[PDB]
């Protein structure tokens, strides 16, 4: 490829990596919601088992 | 052992069709990638991509048809009769296989064989 094509590709990849950084920050920001959802679903399963174990 | 769902026969049919379309797209992609290109399409890129996208569309349509008619007829048989067994879904698999695969294969014995195979695979479920 031409030198300028290579450099334009490198600039595109730099933009892609900065977007990846934004994605990682977003995923980090939603840890608490995910743990809360996990806890609620675990409680659902445990209540269902304890009610089914009763019979 | 099954008590995790919200159901909905119309939603069941819609989601089954969507899942079938996705599976057909992926399967058509794999089929297109596996085959070679004809000799008069090796120095040209566009026709190969067009053929791949056509294969994806065709197989997605066919698999969506299977996944929709199967679930729809299964529910319509279990609703109008109001009994839950593997007998319902066996008829749905039979009709889905027969209808769609005989439309595509253009044959009555192929439709019957597809229906029988689908009914067996649903009876084992």
């Amino acid at each position: 490829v031409k030198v300028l094509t290579y450099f334009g590709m490198t600039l595109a990849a730099f933009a892609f990596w900065q977007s990846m950084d934004k994605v990682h920050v977003w995923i980090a920001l939603h840890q608490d919601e995910k743990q809360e959802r996990m806890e609620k679903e675990a409680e659902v399963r445990r209540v269902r088992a304890e009610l089914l174990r009763k019979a | 052992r099954y008590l995790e769902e919200e159901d909905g026969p119309l939603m069941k049919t819609i989601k089954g069709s969507i899942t079938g379309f996705g599976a057909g797209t992926i399967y058509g992609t794999i089929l297109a990638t596996w085959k070679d290109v004809p000799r008069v399409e090796r120095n040209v890129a566009l026709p190969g991509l067009i053929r791949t996208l056509k294969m994806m569309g065709t197989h997605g349509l066919t698999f969506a048809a299977i996944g929709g008619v199967y679930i729809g007829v299964e529910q319509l048989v279990q609703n109008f009769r109001s009994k839950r067994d593997f007998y319902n879904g066996a008829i749905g698999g039979f009709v889905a296989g027969a209808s769609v695969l005989g439309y595509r294969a253009r044959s009555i014995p192929t439709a019957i064989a597809a229906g029988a195979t689908l009914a067996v695979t649903s009876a084992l479920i």
Binding site: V1, Y6, T10, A13, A28 | I26, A45, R51
Partner: protein, 174 residues
């Protein structure tokens, strides 16, 4: 930011390795990926490994590839193929691998978000381990030849197999 720059250079160079029409060019772009990797290793503080990637991967392995691929004189017709038809399958496989595999550490290694506060004063410094510092070279050499010497010798056996195979497969004595 520097990691972003090196990541972009490695991404483009690797794309060039797998997509160059001329294999010789593919080998030369592979050397650029190895130089970039060496820079990353220098950022990690592992200077011995950064230099050894230059000595071995570029100085020996890539030279082997270049010597062989140059004397082949490969004509483009024997290896050419239009790759537009592989966009969908590569898209699917790459997207699946990307989502499952670029975020495999996120749940186990949750990143520390950079706050608008100087958290660099909370750096505790222990002078006991700084009295006599070991280089990465000495730390590796403390272990290779005594506590894990069997693996060292097995690697030697691997190299001996390489030599014997190279001779038995290619030698035509004059």
């Amino acid at each position: 930011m520097i990691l972003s720059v090196l990541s972009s250079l490695a991404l483009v160079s690797g794309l060039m390795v797998v997509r160059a029409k001329n294999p010789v060019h593919s080998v030369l772009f592979f050397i650029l990926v190895f130089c970039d990797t060496s820079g990353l290793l220098l950022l990690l503080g592992l200077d011995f490994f950064a230099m050894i990637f230059l000595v071995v991967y570029i100085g020996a392995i890539a030279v082997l590839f270049l010597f062989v691929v140059m004397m082949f004189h490969i004509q483009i017709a024997e290896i050419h193929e239009e790759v537009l038809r592989y966009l969908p399958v590569s898209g699917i496989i790459g997207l699946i691998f990307w989502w499952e595999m670029f975020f495999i550490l996120d749940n186990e290694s949750i990143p520390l978000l950079p706050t608008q506060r100087n958290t660099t004063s909370l750096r505790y410094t222990v002078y006991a381990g700084k009295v006599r510092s070991w280089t990465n070279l000495e730390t590796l050499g403390n272990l290779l030849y005594t506590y894990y010497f069997v693996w060292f010798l097995v690697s030697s056996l691997i190299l001996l197999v390489a030599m014997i195979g190279a001779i038995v497969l290619t030698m035509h004595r004059t």
